[PDB]
A paper describes a structure:
Gap junction intercellular channels (GJIChs) facilitate direct communication between adjacent cells and play important roles in various biological processes such as cardiac contraction, electrical coupling, cell differentiation, and death. GJIChs are formed when two opposing hemichannels (also called connexons) from adjacent cells are docked, each being composed of six connexin (Cx) protomers. Cx43, also known as GJA1, is the most ubiquitously expressed connexin protein. We identify three different N-terminal helix conformations of Cx43—gate-covering (GCN), pore-lining (PLN), and flexible intermediate (FIN)—that are randomly distributed in purified GJICh particles.
Because the full GCN Cx43 GJICh structure in lipid nanodiscs that mainly contain POPE and CHS (condition 7) was assessed at a high resolution of 2.4 Å, we could clearly identify POPE and CHS molecules and understand their detailed interactions with the channel. First, we found many ordered acyl chains (gray space-filling models) bound not only to the channel exterior but also to the interior. Second, we identified densities consistent with two CHS molecules bound to each protomer in the hydrophobic interior of the channel (pink space-filling models or sticks, referred to as CHS1 and CHS2). CHS1 was located in a deep hydrophobic pocket formed between NTH, TM1, and TM2. While the sterol ring of CHS1 interacted closely with L26, F30, T89, and L93, its hydrocarbon tail interacted with L90. CHS2 was located between CHS1 and NTHs. Third, we identified a strong map density of POPE in each hole between neighboring NTHs in which both the hydrophobic tails and hydrophilic head of POPE were able to be modeled. The lipid tails closely interacted with W4, L7, L11, and F97 of Cx43 within 5 Å and with CHS2, completely obstructing the hole. In the lipid head, the phosphate group formed a salt bridge with R101 and interacted with S5. Collectively, these structural analyses strongly suggest that CHS and POPE molecules bind to NTHs, TM1s, and/or TM2s in Cx43 GJICh to almost completely mask solvent-exposed hydrophobic surfaces and stabilize the conformation of the GCN.
Residue numbers in the entry:
A (entry chain A), B (entry chain F), C (entry chain E), D (entry chain D), E (entry chain B), F (entry chain C): 2 to 111, 148 to 238
The structure:
Amino acid sequence: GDWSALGKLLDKVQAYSTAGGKVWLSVLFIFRILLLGTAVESAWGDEQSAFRCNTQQPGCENVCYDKSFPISHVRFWVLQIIFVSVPTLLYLAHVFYVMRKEEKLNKKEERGGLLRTYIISILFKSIFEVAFLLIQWYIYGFSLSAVYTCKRDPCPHQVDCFLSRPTEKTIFIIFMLVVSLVSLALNIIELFYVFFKGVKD
Amino acid sequence: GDWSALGKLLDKVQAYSTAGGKVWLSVLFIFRILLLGTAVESAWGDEQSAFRCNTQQPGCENVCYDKSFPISHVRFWVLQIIFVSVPTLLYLAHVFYVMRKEEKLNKKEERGGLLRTYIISILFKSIFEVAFLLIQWYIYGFSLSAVYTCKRDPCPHQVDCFLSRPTEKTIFIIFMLVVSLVSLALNIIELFYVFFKGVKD
Amino acid sequence: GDWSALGKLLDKVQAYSTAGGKVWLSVLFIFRILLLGTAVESAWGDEQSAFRCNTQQPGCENVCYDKSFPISHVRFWVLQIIFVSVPTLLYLAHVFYVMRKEEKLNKKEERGGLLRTYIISILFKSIFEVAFLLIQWYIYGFSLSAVYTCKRDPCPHQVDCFLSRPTEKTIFIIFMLVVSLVSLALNIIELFYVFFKGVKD
Amino acid sequence: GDWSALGKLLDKVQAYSTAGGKVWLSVLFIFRILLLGTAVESAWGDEQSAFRCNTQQPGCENVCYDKSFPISHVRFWVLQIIFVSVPTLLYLAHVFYVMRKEEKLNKKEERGGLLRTYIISILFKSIFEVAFLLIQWYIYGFSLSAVYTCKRDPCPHQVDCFLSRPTEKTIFIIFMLVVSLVSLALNIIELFYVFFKGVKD
Amino acid sequence: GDWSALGKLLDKVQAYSTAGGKVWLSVLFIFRILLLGTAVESAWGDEQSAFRCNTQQPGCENVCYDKSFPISHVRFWVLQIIFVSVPTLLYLAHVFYVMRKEEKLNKKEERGGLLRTYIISILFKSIFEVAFLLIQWYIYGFSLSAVYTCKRDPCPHQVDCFLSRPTEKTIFIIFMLVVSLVSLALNIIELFYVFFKGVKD
Amino acid sequence: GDWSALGKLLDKVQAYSTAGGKVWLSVLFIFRILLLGTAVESAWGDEQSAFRCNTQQPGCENVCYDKSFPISHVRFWVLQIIFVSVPTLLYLAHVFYVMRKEEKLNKKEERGGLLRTYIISILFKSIFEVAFLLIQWYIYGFSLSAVYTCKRDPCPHQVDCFLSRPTEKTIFIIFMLVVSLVSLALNIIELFYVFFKGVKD
Ligand SMILES: CC(C)CCC[C@@H](C)[C@H]1CC[C@H]2[C@@H]3CC=C4C[C@@H](OC(=O)CCC(=O)O)CC[C@]4(C)[C@H]3CC[C@]12C
Ligand SMILES: CC(C)CCC[C@@H](C)[C@H]1CC[C@H]2[C@@H]3CC=C4C[C@@H](OC(=O)CCC(=O)O)CC[C@]4(C)[C@H]3CC[C@]12C
Ligand SMILES: CC(C)CCC[C@@H](C)[C@H]1CC[C@H]2[C@@H]3CC=C4C[C@@H](OC(=O)CCC(=O)O)CC[C@]4(C)[C@H]3CC[C@]12C
Ligand SMILES: CC(C)CCC[C@@H](C)[C@H]1CC[C@H]2[C@@H]3CC=C4C[C@@H](OC(=O)CCC(=O)O)CC[C@]4(C)[C@H]3CC[C@]12C
Ligand SMILES: CC(C)CCC[C@@H](C)[C@H]1CC[C@H]2[C@@H]3CC=C4C[C@@H](OC(=O)CCC(=O)O)CC[C@]4(C)[C@H]3CC[C@]12C
Ligand SMILES: CCCCCCCCCCCCCC
Ligand SMILES: CCCCCCCCCCCCCC
Ligand SMILES: CCCCCCCCCCCCCC
Ligand SMILES: CCCCCCCCCCCCCC
Ligand SMILES: CCCCCCCCCCCCCC
Ligand SMILES: CCCCCCCCCCCCCC
């Protein structure tokens, strides 16, 4: 039995968090990863192979697909989740090393230090979430249409192209938007709780 | 040997459940996941590649497939199982944190609190199951036909399209319906048992 | 070292079984799963992609393949093995919970109960095996021919279609039949042994 | 530290084996599995997709491929290795249960039994190896030619077909033959050793 | 519980490193591997299958693709990360063996040795990073264009070819460049810290 | 904590090896396996599917590809590494069994034996490496050209065929050659060290 120090680490990491935030946020993270890995990823498999355009011009399909989709939704979401997750990993590593140093100090010699970093990490999580949402809104919006109009060389004049599985992708896009909004709300709630408990001194 | 606290956690989680519900429900969950992962998923692999329509119009197959299948059955079932499973995970996390707090209290100082949450979780499981069943009934029904009639642009007039493996998919749809009904019945039985043991005080 | 309770569980599960049945049945289960997972599954990979028919009618291949194979052999066998395996898992869970309850009783306070369930589980294993064998015999038989005659709309008149790897699939079908028969015989032997030891009182 | 009983089990399993047989046979088994899993399996991937025949007759390629290859070499070898391996697993299970029973006896109450089964297992290993070698020799031989002549309906007269990667497959076939011969020789040596140590009493 | 010597090893490995370098560099390594494995690798899947050229000359596409891409970006990055990682593994092995030898010495008999190797390893990490960046700049630059002009035999005169997913690949190239620059900066900072603490004696 | 006997085994295995050989050779093995598994294997995926020839003769591509590549480079390298690795596994097994026997002897009864086998194993490692290098030099050389000339039936006269990714494969071939040479040099150094320490007695 060697799982005790893990309990101590967990307790020290979540010193300033609310009772409900732990459960809700962790389960949301698990839900996010499972949804992205099982169902979402497979629906984008034939994103380019099933993409078709009405033309005989060689090379037009390539450029029209590139123009329609500068970056895939799934890879964008992977980047988003990695960026939202990195700060917590940094905080965990910092806490681990601090605990080791404190053990050294208090063995050989028989607020603000960690609160500030925690606040910064939460702020950066929220900032990254908002930035990714804004970028997605600017680039794509939150829906996909069946027919796309392409006006890029070497295609002559304008051509019509047809997407793959637009409705299913729209449904999943809405799901991901809802998940992101919930996560942002929870993080904002945590920030307000910490600041409102700090005011009373 | 460090598996004792796991036994305590398991005992405290299942305080209010019946003797048979544990076994039947857990085995049903295992059966559900195995069936979805091994046999069901592979049968839908060529759902769009083997989909064909009788026409020379470019883009008609894409739109007709999109209209026929707004969302795949397998991904719908994955969403259903995740939604049905989340509440139990939330309850487990809550119980774990409560047990840690109680250990702190009863070490340093040498009904209704948890019953309500358990009842709420069971109710939400049943609610999600019923909602998913109703949505599936409204959208698809519980069978698939070999020939589909498509009347969507840019297809001219109406066209005929042909599905892949309709009979096998019908069989698996019936299987999944039966499994869902059994799960709903077991949850309702658990609710009735708890309420009937609460009446006698 | 924390593997003792596992030994106790194993001993209590196999109280009423014969000496040889354990080894033979467990090794048969391992053989079944390995054979199904390694060699059998790969041979059915191109079951529909390599299926061909002599015709120019669009949609005829889809319907003819659907008629020829209402359900794939591999998925049928997966269903069979899952159904044959579930009762033992149920019995194991029941025994585990009973043992925990008995430990509680005999710690705090310092035939027929389990025999009946064991008999029922063995009976249901045999029943499922026989039912699956009968269904397979009725639907397919125990061989596959190279040429198939199709008389389904929209195909005009009758058409000829050609299967993929008929001889190899026939060989594997015979193998699976032999395995199923051996398993059924072993289960029947166990039933006879228990009933013949119960007669002498 | 709970690895002691494993050492006892290993010692009791290999009571009657020679000093060198252990190492050589175990390393040969590891070599066999690695070779089959890493290099051999990938070389047969496009066995049917790259198979081609000179004809316009629909369905001729299917039947000609089926006639040329009643069963794939890789799946045949998988069956061979499973059959050669099962007896040792049976013997291990028997020894495990016997050891548990003996522990019970010698705790509560503070040659020929196992030798015969070991001899039978070794004999069956050798028998299966020889049978598989004979079957392979009768069906295929130990080489593959680039051009195959097909005289099966519905192909008219005779047609020429061309295999994929014949030389590489020939090389691997020779490798597998050598491995099988070495294994058979080692098993025969073990049999002779046991019988020659039994003669002196 | 047998995780203590691992703690000692970790402490002795990071004797001369700064407090922040540990966390930042380790998290950067994890980020690098995750990004390369999840999102980046899949975007290059159809790098050659979707590559197209405007010509009827057989063999022109092969040679034009070979000329355009002497080596794939993903495999280049895999080589880069392996080369950047090997020195730390060498240092860890050296430290492990030195610790074992010191344990022998100090049990049986009841700066510069390791600092130099650490400095050399850090220097080589930075050197490899810079070399790979320079090679990539010389060969490809840091962007990809949609249209490529090919003037290689047997293609007649010059031909136009079209890439797959140029914009997404450009985005990921920029990401990887930023990551490499950050890693180089951190290593240089570590070198300066060690040399500036060595000056004061 | 049960990792002590592993330390003893490691110490006894490396009794006669030099201080640096351990680290360098082990890291080289890890580098070899990682390089072969991650980057090299994927570059040969479309070795036959992207192989093309200028002709209308059916069957010519098959025979020309077979003649050009009697065996794939990746599978050749897998065979090489397995052959180079087997002797060390044999030596480890022998040492393990010898240690068990010595424990028996020295518990119940409260150079040349192993040196010779170690020398033989090292010699065989070097021999296999040299043999594989010579075979590769004789068959292929150490580069690949873009255009191949084929003069095999049923192709008429001579035909031109075009390879896939020749430059990248050439680069990786050079890398593997360098790795093999380094490994051979290290093994020769170990042999010279042991023989030069044996001369002084
Ligand atoms: C082993 C390596 C290569 C990958 C797996 C390690 C990390 C990437 C994992 C381990 C624990 C995970 C965390 C577990 C749960 C949370 C929930 C959530 O964070 C919080 O709940 C913070 C507030 C709180 O916990 O009280 C956001 C994701 C996060 C940080 C996870 C992010 C990813 C983490 C750091
Ligand atoms: C490790 C993480 C990333 C994924 C795996 C963890 C959970 C998703 C698993 C662990 C235990 C599972 C549960 C085990 C068994 C049950 C049976 C069933 O629930 C009940 O039986 C509730 C009533 C009772 O147990 O008495 C419904 C599924 C559920 C909750 C499972 C849902 C999924 C759970 C929570
Ligand atoms: C971890 C979960 C998600 C999947 C793996 C757990 C079960 C599906 C496994 C564990 C042990 C297995 C059993 C091990 C061996 C047997 C042999 C055989 O049953 C018997 O031999 C019963 C009679 C006897 O054992 O004496 C039939 C399969 C069965 C029950 C297996 C069925 C599948 C079981 C229950
Ligand atoms: C099990 C084998 C087959 C593969 C996995 C083992 C190694 C390849 C791993 C184990 C730990 C890893 C290291 C963990 C973290 C670091 C962070 C970073 O190095 C440092 O931070 C050095 C400075 C410091 O740690 O203070 C660069 C990658 C590196 C060395 C990693 C490189 C890859 C390592 C050596
Ligand atoms: C678990 C099984 C199925 C596969 C994995 C086990 C073996 C194939 C591994 C375990 C340790 C490995 C060895 C670890 C390191 C070395 C380095 C190198 O050998 C030496 O360094 C010998 C000289 C020395 O170590 O001092 C060549 C590869 C070799 C023997 C490896 C070959 C493959 C080995 C034997
Ligand atoms: C008993 C719990 C079962 C969990 C099922 C997990 C399925 C595997 C999904 C792996 C891909 C998603 C994570 C990247
Ligand atoms: C001994 C028990 C064997 C269990 C077989 C499991 C097969 C692997 C299936 C993995 C996919 C389904 C879960 C997502
Ligand atoms: C040392 C034993 C090796 C076992 C080989 C297992 C091969 C992996 C097969 C996985 C698929 C079959 C189970 C679903
Ligand atoms: C350190 C040892 C590495 C072992 C490499 C194993 C490669 C994985 C091969 C898995 C397929 C073959 C077994 C079925
Ligand atoms: C709970 C943490 C989940 C981690 C997700 C990892 C996904 C698997 C990615 C594997 C490929 C990248 C490493 C090579
Ligand atoms: C933390 C270390 C990560 C190691 C990455 C390994 C990637 C998986 C590669 C597996 C194929 C190569 C071995 C056969």
